[PDB]
Amino acid sequence: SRYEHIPGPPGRVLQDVFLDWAKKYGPVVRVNVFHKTSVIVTSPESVKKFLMSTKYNKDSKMYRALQTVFGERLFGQGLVSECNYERWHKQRRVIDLAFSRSSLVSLMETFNEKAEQLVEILEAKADGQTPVSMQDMLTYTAMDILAKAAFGMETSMLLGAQKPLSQAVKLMLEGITASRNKRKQLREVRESIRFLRQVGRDWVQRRREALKRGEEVPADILTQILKAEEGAQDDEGLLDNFVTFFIAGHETSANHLAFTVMELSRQPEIVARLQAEVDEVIGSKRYLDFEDLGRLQYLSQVLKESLRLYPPAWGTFRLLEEETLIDGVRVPGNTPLLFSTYVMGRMDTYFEDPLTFNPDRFGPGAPKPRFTYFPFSLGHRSCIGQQFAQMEVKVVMAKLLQRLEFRLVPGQRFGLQEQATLKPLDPVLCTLRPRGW
């Protein structure tokens, strides 16, 4: 009853329903999300007010399904799911060191090596006939990159290894979804979460044993994850961040790559322009240097436009503590506010012809979106891995565009699914040819 006065209702996803309601009912709309009454806020004035202030913190109730699933601790109080400002700030500042310019520049070797491995695997299948799941292949690549870059470990998913680990991730993601929106499913989800935490325990032991033997350990994300736990009573905080980074550090990047390949399959002119750009910047070089990344300007725009229509992480929640007027609507105290870059990206009020894929929206001369576009969120709780992700995806995309032509298999859909994050409903099945053919 406390919300009844708020405007609202009395390969398609829940986010599409929210979009329809925002269009119908205005910038402040009552909705049910994660079993809780929330208010979706879609004015840029509100995005700015709430996201750009340390006064507004995440609503812990809306992160429960990341913290724990079916009684199994998952992300716990890791960097994404910690909602206490002071606890978050402490760990954020330590882990930030692993995302410095210099830290990220050193990762270019890993990015290049895994992208090269992917391209070689794909080239061998480029007979214009063999169907290849680009969603699967890009997910394996993202996983392999993350494991090496963040933890110094070789998952070798591109070689067909670690199928149990692949299964564990899938079931865990299904578990999050089931929790927030029987006997065998619970068993499989619980065991999957325990498995992921066990991988953490194993890899942490390997790190600590290497350090004690005085072997060479390159500073990485794990280094800082350990540093943040220096004098902790147990390893539960460490494992929280291990799992957080293990999942967050590949899942959204994989989704973003899959969406981009999927969309580009019906954009031949844009693809021809991307092919030309890659040809001009990197030529026949096997390896992309950091300085080459900045020169791939058109690719940068395509990837931004991809995130406008297809943000893997659709938004975020803040807790409104006290009754506040939001865009002429009285919103009661102790209310989750939902911010969605997905919704705002598809609203004609914010983007002309919103369903048109147009990289020119992000052109040098173009007016930059003002608080209407946030695929990495905004403010203090923005994505720590933004620059990491932007670099790795550019390396992967550039090498694909350098070497291969993709055709989406007829019947493949462009629809979305929500599985904790947004991703293509279909496997992005393509046939492939070498460039030139």
Ligand code: HEM
């Ligand atoms: C294209 C790829 C990516 C997208 C679209 C993305 C998106 C986001 C978004 C929207 C948030 C805010 C989430 C919230 O408010 O609940 C976030 C936070 C975060 N992301 Fe990402 N992300 C990406 C890649 C990565 C990578 C590569 C890493 C790690 C290597 C990562 C780790 C994190 C972490 C740890 C947070 C929590 C940050 C904090 O609260 O201090 N993400 N990301």
Ligand SMILES: O=C(C1CC1)n1ccc2c(-c3cnco3)cc(C(F)(F)F)cc21
């Ligand atoms: O579920 C939520 C919230 C409450 C809405 N999330 C907020 C960001 C995020 C990320 C992520 C952020 N950067 C990289 O990955 C990943 C996932 C997961 F694990 F399901 F894949 C869930 C996420």
